[PDB]
Amino acid sequence: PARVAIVMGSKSDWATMQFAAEIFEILNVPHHVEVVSAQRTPDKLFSFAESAEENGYQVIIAGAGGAAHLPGMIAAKTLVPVLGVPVQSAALSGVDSLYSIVQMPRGIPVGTLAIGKAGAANAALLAAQILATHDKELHQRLNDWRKAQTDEVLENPDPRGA
Amino acid sequence: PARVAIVMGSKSDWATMQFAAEIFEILNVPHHVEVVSAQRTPDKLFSFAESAEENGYQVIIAGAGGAAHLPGMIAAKTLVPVLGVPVQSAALSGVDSLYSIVQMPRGIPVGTLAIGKAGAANAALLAAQILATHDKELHQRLNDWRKAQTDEVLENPDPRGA
Amino acid sequence: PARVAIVMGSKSDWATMQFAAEIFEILNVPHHVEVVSAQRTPDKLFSFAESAEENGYQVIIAGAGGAAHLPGMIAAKTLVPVLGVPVQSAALSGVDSLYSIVQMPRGIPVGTLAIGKAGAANAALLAAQILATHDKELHQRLNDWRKAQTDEVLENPDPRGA
Amino acid sequence: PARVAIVMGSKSDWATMQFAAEIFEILNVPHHVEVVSAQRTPDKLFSFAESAEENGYQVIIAGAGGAAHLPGMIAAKTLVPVLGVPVQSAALSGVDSLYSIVQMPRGIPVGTLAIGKAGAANAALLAAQILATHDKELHQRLNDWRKAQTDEVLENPDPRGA
Amino acid sequence: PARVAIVMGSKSDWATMQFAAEIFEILNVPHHVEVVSAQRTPDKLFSFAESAEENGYQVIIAGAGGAAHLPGMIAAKTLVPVLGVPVQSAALSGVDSLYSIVQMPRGIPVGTLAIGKAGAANAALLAAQILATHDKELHQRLNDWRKAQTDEVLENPDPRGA
Amino acid sequence: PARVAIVMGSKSDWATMQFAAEIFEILNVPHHVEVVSAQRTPDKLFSFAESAEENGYQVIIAGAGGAAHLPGMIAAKTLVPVLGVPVQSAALSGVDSLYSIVQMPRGIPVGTLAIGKAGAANAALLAAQILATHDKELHQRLNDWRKAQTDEVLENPDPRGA
Amino acid sequence: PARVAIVMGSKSDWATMQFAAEIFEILNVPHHVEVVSAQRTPDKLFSFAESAEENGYQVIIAGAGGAAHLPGMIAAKTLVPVLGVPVQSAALSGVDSLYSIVQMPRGIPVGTLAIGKAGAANAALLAAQILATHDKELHQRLNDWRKAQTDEVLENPDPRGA
Amino acid sequence: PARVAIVMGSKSDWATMQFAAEIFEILNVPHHVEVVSAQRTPDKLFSFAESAEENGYQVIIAGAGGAAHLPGMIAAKTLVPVLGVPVQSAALSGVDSLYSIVQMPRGIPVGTLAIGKAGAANAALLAAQILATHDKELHQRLNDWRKAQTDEVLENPDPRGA
Ligand SMILES: Nc1c(C(=O)O)ncn1[C@@H]1O[C@H](COP(=O)(O)O)[C@@H](O)[C@H]1O
Ligand SMILES: Nc1c(C(=O)O)ncn1[C@@H]1O[C@H](COP(=O)(O)O)[C@@H](O)[C@H]1O
Ligand SMILES: Nc1c(C(=O)O)ncn1[C@@H]1O[C@H](COP(=O)(O)O)[C@@H](O)[C@H]1O
Ligand SMILES: Nc1c(C(=O)O)ncn1[C@@H]1O[C@H](COP(=O)(O)O)[C@@H](O)[C@H]1O
Ligand SMILES: Nc1c(C(=O)O)ncn1[C@@H]1O[C@H](COP(=O)(O)O)[C@@H](O)[C@H]1O
Ligand SMILES: Nc1c(C(=O)O)ncn1[C@@H]1O[C@H](COP(=O)(O)O)[C@@H](O)[C@H]1O
Ligand SMILES: Nc1c(C(=O)O)ncn1[C@@H]1O[C@H](COP(=O)(O)O)[C@@H](O)[C@H]1O
Ligand SMILES: Nc1c(C(=O)O)ncn1[C@@H]1O[C@H](COP(=O)(O)O)[C@@H](O)[C@H]1O
């Protein structure tokens, strides 16, 4: 039973969003992946957002580049937490993606993560921390993961070559 | 028969969008004004956009501030030309409004005008020039208007006080 | 039992963060408010973050202006979801607050909301949607709230004065 | 009879503007292409703009990079709708192109599209939607095109490799 | 015989451009002031630029705000040195004025000064230094002026109140 | 007798500044080239600026990247017109170069040209137009050059391949 | 014996730089204040920088707004540590001040603090920490100060009114 | 006895921070290098900062990219001068690194250097100038170094190829 959905406005966003999925694979969290566009498939987005709850999703991670409307439009149609991932656009290096996602006016929110791939991974981690709140097992895996990332740095203090 | 519609995401946008309407009043162009929000009234926006053509609109002028989704969402649902007006937001002085409107990816366009009030007036003028293409009378009024703005500057070359 | 904590780097941030609390009051969600600074009270922040879970918090909302370190430092010390609120700084109008919060590298996330007051309210709404996932009652209040914001716009389509 | 003109300040802009023309080819819309510069061929621009109407153009698409003056200067000389396309400049990645085109003060407008190639295609699509208003056939082709772009996404929901 | 001309796109620019004129008054340099707009009075601008040399102007100072086209259009039509002054716009605080003036592509230049009033004064000073090259008297006044500005600072080293 | 000097803060700036010199070669204008740094050779800069007039220079073109101090420091020490050329820096793509050059406060000016190579060529053209004011021959060559750049565009209107 | 000097390009900078001095007063650190401009008093700056060491200064704090050259020019002439303070400019809100100070190329550094007043205070604190390295007494006062700022926050955790 | 410490948030920062170390090697200044992350190794950072003084460090140079918290967190925990180095991030080219480091509010400072490698070298030079204050020998080496960089430019005035 997938409790988290990863959507994006175009398959060209997959080079970025694959990092969110990679986190779910490492953490063994079931997840659904799909290309949904508020701009190119407006009706499927509405349909998708309206059935998000009945489908069992507790968190939705939406990525888009440029004038990103996907995240906000999904949020406007559901009470399921939506996390936004700014994909790096060619011309404005994701700054346009960032502003169009994070600058939501009062009433409909979207938790936004960093521009690009680091944000893809983080949105998955954030979604995982949200679920772990009521899943002791995942919570344990999440703590194992953090343990690993920390010790990796600790056991490798000197950046210089031997 | 109103051939142009002026929508905005919030009545707080009216302080800006009133300048678009002022142009239509001066040019005697019938127009419809309404607050439609892709974020707060998503279903009314869909309904609105889908019936835009059958309603007789040939141009739509949409204004929004911050992460502006209104313009793009309307454009995604209709073939009626959509002109975007970036409303000046408090924190980013409309830069977030501008990027979220103008940076549309390939497939669904939005002709964007200047940030703020000057853009409101211009979107109305642009819409008027679009209609004048098949309305000799309005075309004449538009030329009278341009004549007036030009001569006003011409007959007042010295900015200094007498 | 407060399941959500609202922290900020300075009481000068309260003029902004009060809007997050206002949402919790309207939605009748118990909440804890406190001024914690990663910069001025580093030890209390560590202590605070480390005991967040044992204290019962399921979401933490942290606001800061300028070079905002509070959100990221709390996130680095706990698995409790952290939502960041960029407070509007004088010189860079919150852009420095925004970048220092949202641009977290891979490993420790922070769901970021809009700059300023609109972001304060939204972070509370987002936190509320996170909790509502396992609280049918709050979920109902959240839907009542959205219903109200939508109908308010619907029953007031003409921005012009009567 | 070409009802739409595509101009640009330099043939170096063609790598970008070719995408506008590609749309007209797909949609079978007659079009004129020409390099006109307000900066390097000021007199030909005036001559060009002044005869735009008598030449039968109903829409003009102008692309320029850097301090783009072409779009605004054409608009100042004709009532024919002008759509601006910000070409990506080396140093400012088209941000200078964008501001010099979209930030027109009150009186002479220019509908601006996205920076770069996506904007080139969109300006053509926008111009096509303007013409389709009084051309049922093109309107039909435009709807066929949108149908195709939408179903392409719909019939390919999973971005992952088989 | 006025050897320097001060033009601007609108009399609303005078609040800024008056500082350029103030320099000429202090330095006793004859000068012509006039509101010329490439956008609102395109033909008068052409006429103006084409006759600049025969009129005796050796330097032209042009100020404009927003998408400033005035400076570049004048430069495109004459060999008389053109200095640009970015007027502070409301929304983008003159950044749009700055980019549209300074970012001229190869072939037609415009020496650009600071945004706002400080730039107005400086463009006049720069123009004065250009003329002083072949005017020993003005050159002397210019050196007297610099002497005065320097000693004013020198004879007042402590910013604190007595 | 070289009437114009081209200086730069580092020989790494030559890849850019060579375009200014190329203009002088085409226009047959004697010129001096030299690497002077306000930061690395402060005393030689002072010495250089103070003797600029006695050396016969009527215009100085200074290029620098990053926090560019060269142009302003030269201007502070001489009455000889100084034109600034923002060299494209790695991190901020010349935006830091641009602001540190153009944003001079009241009293000491610097005519600034576009970021990068296009600005290098233009500063040379601008300097040439300044000299041509009292050199009919160069003025003629300058007009021949403009004639050539214009006709090149005119005789090549179609950007498409034959 | 003043071991730290506070300079600024104009007495108009005092409204900002007074906060640096306020720190020295609280910490009882002798200090010299003076208006020195690289742009308006270039020779006094050279003289000043060259004698900084023989005068006993161990740290220099320089503030400037707009295209700030003061900090860098002082650093180029002395080995005494120079700390830069970006004064908030009207048009670019200190962003131009910031880039012109912090973006120093390799060879001559300037430790830069925050834009505006907070940066003024911090540069003084940083200078104080530099001196405290070889002054146990000041080091003690610095620790008393930090103690006070921390406990002030600690003993006032609830931002709300009683 | 190493009197200066060079830390960074990740070994991926070494490609940049190696330039700081290179300066210490040339100047023969003992130094400690280590990867410390406020985000990934929060406890080791605290431990590290708290023992900085007892370890003999008189200056700390911290580099980080993106939302850089390392510098500020170290500064919050020690009185040892901290110099920040903005590492160039992929998406925002170090602008996010710069703002998150330099924009520290009143109370805890961080002397910030240029974005990237030039800043790495400079922070080392600045730290060296701080130490040289009480080390005549290093002070001499520092002056030898500056002598060399200056004469290198002086003895190579013509950037052109022989
Ligand atoms: N911004 C959106 C939306 C939306 O907001 O609905 N749909 C697609 N996109 C973005 O368009 C960019 C280019 O897409 P293509 O590569 O298909 O041209 C992608 O980054 C996508 O996320
Ligand atoms: N961006 C949008 C949308 C939308 O994109 O659908 N709906 C409203 N808004 C913007 O929210 C801002 C603040 O609105 P309120 O004053 O009601 O808080 C307005 O500028 C509106 O255009
Ligand atoms: N950025 C931080 C941190 C932190 O990151 O720990 N602590 C306080 N601050 C910010 O300092 C700004 C000015 O605070 P003061 O008004 O006390 O000078 C506030 O916006 C606070 O959030
Ligand atoms: N901005 C303008 C204008 C104009 O505004 O009239 N004419 C040319 N350009 C731009 O100059 C850039 C470089 O042109 P070149 O490659 O010929 O140097 C192009 O992007 C063109 O659009
Ligand atoms: N940018 C230009 C041009 C031009 O480029 O020709 N003409 C006027 N303007 C600018 O329009 C702004 C607002 O003018 P108004 O106050 O008349 O609305 C002014 O800053 C003017 O310089
Ligand atoms: N900004 C200045 C100054 C100055 O302002 O005096 N001197 C050199 N520079 C710039 O340093 C950059 C890197 O120089 P290097 O390649 O030698 O590291 C160049 O763009 C130069 O113009
Ligand atoms: N940037 C510099 C320099 C310099 O760099 O030498 N000298 C003065 N200034 C700045 O000019 C601004 C306006 O000064 P005025 O108020 O006298 O016009 C101030 O912020 C000063 O620091
Ligand atoms: N900003 C910080 C912090 C911190 O602030 O504690 N720790 C690491 N980082 C930055 O993360 C970026 C990417 O690191 P990785 O290459 O490991 O993904 C680096 O620039 C590091 O300085």
Report whether E101 contacts E112 (CB < 8 A): yes
Number of H helices, E strands in chain D: 6, 5
Task: Give the number of residues written for chain D.
Answer: 162
User: CA-to-CA distance for C83 and C71, rounded, in angstroms?
Assistant: 7
User: CA-to-CA distance for F72 and F112, rounded, in angstroms?
Assistant: 11
DSSP secondary structure string for all residues of G17-64: HHHHHHHHHHTT--EEEEE--TTT-HHHHHHHHHTTTTTT-SEEEEEE
Q: Which of B16, B18, B39 to mutate to test the pocket of ligand 2 (most atoms within 8 A of CB)?
A: B39
Distances (CA, A) of G28 to G18, G22, G132, H106: 15, 10, 12, 18
φ/ψ of residue H60, rounded to 5: -125, 135
Report whether H4 contacts H29 (CB < 8 A): yes
Question: F139: how many CB neighbours lie within 10 A of its CB?
Answer: 17
Query: Is the four-CA dihedral E15, E20, E23, E27 of positive or negative sign?
Result: negative
- H residues 1..30 contacting C (CB < 8 A): 9-10
Question: A135: how many CB neighbours lie within 10 A of its CB?
Answer: 15
- A residues 115..144 contacting H (CB < 8 A): 115-116, 118
Method by which the model was determined: X-ray
Tokens (6 digits) for A116: 């690009």
Could you tell me which of H84, H77, H66 has the C-alpha nearest to residue H42? H77
Could you tell me which of A103, A50, A42 has the C-alpha nearest to residue A75? A50
User: CA-to-CA distance for G121 and G117, rounded, in angstroms?
Assistant: 6
The amino acid at residue G39 is: Q
Q: What is the resolution of this structure in A?
A: 2.3
User: CA-to-CA distance for F20 and F2, rounded, in angstroms?
Assistant: 14
F106 annotated ligand binder:
no
Tokens (6 digits) for F105: 């406060």
Question: H34: how many CB neighbours lie within 10 A of its CB?
Answer: 13
Q: Which CATH number fits domain D1-162: 3.40.50.1970, 3.40.1010.10, 3.60.20.10, 2.30.40.10?
A: 3.40.50.1970
- Taking the Cβ of residue A102 and every Cβ of chain B, the question of whether any pair is shorter than 8 Å is answered with yes
Closest residue to A76, CB basis, from B38, B68, B75: B38
From first CA to last CA, the distance across chain H in angstroms is: 47
R_g over Cα of chain H: 16
- Taking the Cβ of residue F107 and every Cβ of chain E, the question of whether any pair is shorter than 8 Å is answered with yes
DSSP secondary structure string for all residues of B38-95: TTT-HHHHHHHHHTTTTTT-SEEEEEEESS--HHHHHHHH-SS-EEEEEE--TTTTTH
Report whether G38 contacts F105 (CB < 8 A): no
User: CA-to-CA distance for D112 and D86, rounded, in angstroms?
Assistant: 8
Strand order in H82-87's β-sheet?
Answer: G31-35, G4-8, G59-65, G82-87, G111-112, H111-112, H82-87, H59-65, H4-8, H31-35
Question: D139: how many CB neighbours lie within 10 A of its CB?
Answer: 17
The vertex-F12 CA angle with F10 and F17, nearest 5°, equals: 85
User: CA-to-CA distance for F72 and F88, rounded, in angstroms?
Assistant: 18
Q: Mind telling me how many Å the CA of B153 is from chain A's nearest CA? A: 37
Q: Mind telling me how many Å the CA of B126 is from chain D's nearest CA? A: 6
- Taking each helix axis from N to C end, the angle separating F95-102 and F70-77, rounded to the nearest 10 degrees, works out to 10
Tokens (6 digits) for H157: 């005035």
The amino acid at residue C16 is: T
Report whether E85 contacts E120 (CB < 8 A): yes
φ/ψ of residue H93, rounded to 5: 45, 45
Residue written as token pair 């056939």: D137
Q: D111 CB contacts (<8 Å, ≥6 apart)?
A: B83, B111, B112, B113, B126, D81, D82, D83, D84, D123, D126
Tokens (6 digits) for A69: 């409307």
User: CA-to-CA distance for G154 and B152, rounded, in angstroms?
Assistant: 64
E runs forming strands in E53-160: 59-65, 82-87, 111-112
- A105, B69: Cβ pair inside 8 Å? no
SS3 (DSSP) at H82:
strand
Report whether G70 contacts G62 (CB < 8 A): yes
Residue C80 CA neighbour count, 13 Å, CB half: 27
Distances (CA, A) of F142 to A6, D88, F121, F127, F147: 61, 30, 13, 11, 9
Q: Which of C7, C14, C37, C104 to mutate to test the pocket of ligand 3 (most atoms within 8 A of CB)?
A: C37
The number of angstroms, rounded, from the C-alpha of B69 to the middle of its chain's C-alpha atoms is: 15
Strand partners, G6: G33, G61
The amino acid at residue H46 is: F
Domains of chain A, by residue range, sit at 1-162
Could you tell me which of E38, E37, E42 has the C-alpha nearest to residue E10? E37
Give exposure, G65-94, as e/b (b: 16+ Cβ within 10 Å): bbbbbbbbbbbbbbbbbbbbbbbbbebbbb
F74 lines ligand 6 (CB under 6 A): no
φ/ψ of residue H9, rounded to 5: -75, -15
Strand partners, H82: H60
Q: Which residues have CB under 6 Å of ligand 3?
A: C 8-10, 12-13, 37-40, 64-70, 87; H 105-106
Strand order in E82-87's β-sheet?
Answer: E31-35, E4-8, E59-65, E82-87, E111-112, F111-112, F82-87, F59-65, F4-8, F31-35
φ/ψ of residue A63, rounded to 5: -115, 145
User: CA-to-CA distance for C74 and C46, rounded, in angstroms?
Assistant: 7
Q: Mind telling me how many Å the CA of G131 is from chain F's nearest CA? A: 26
A1 lines ligand 2 (CB under 6 A): no
φ/ψ of residue A47, rounded to 5: -55, -45
φ/ψ of residue H83, rounded to 5: -110, 130
User: CA-to-CA distance for F144 and F150, rounded, in angstroms?
Assistant: 10
Residue written as token pair 């690194």: H97
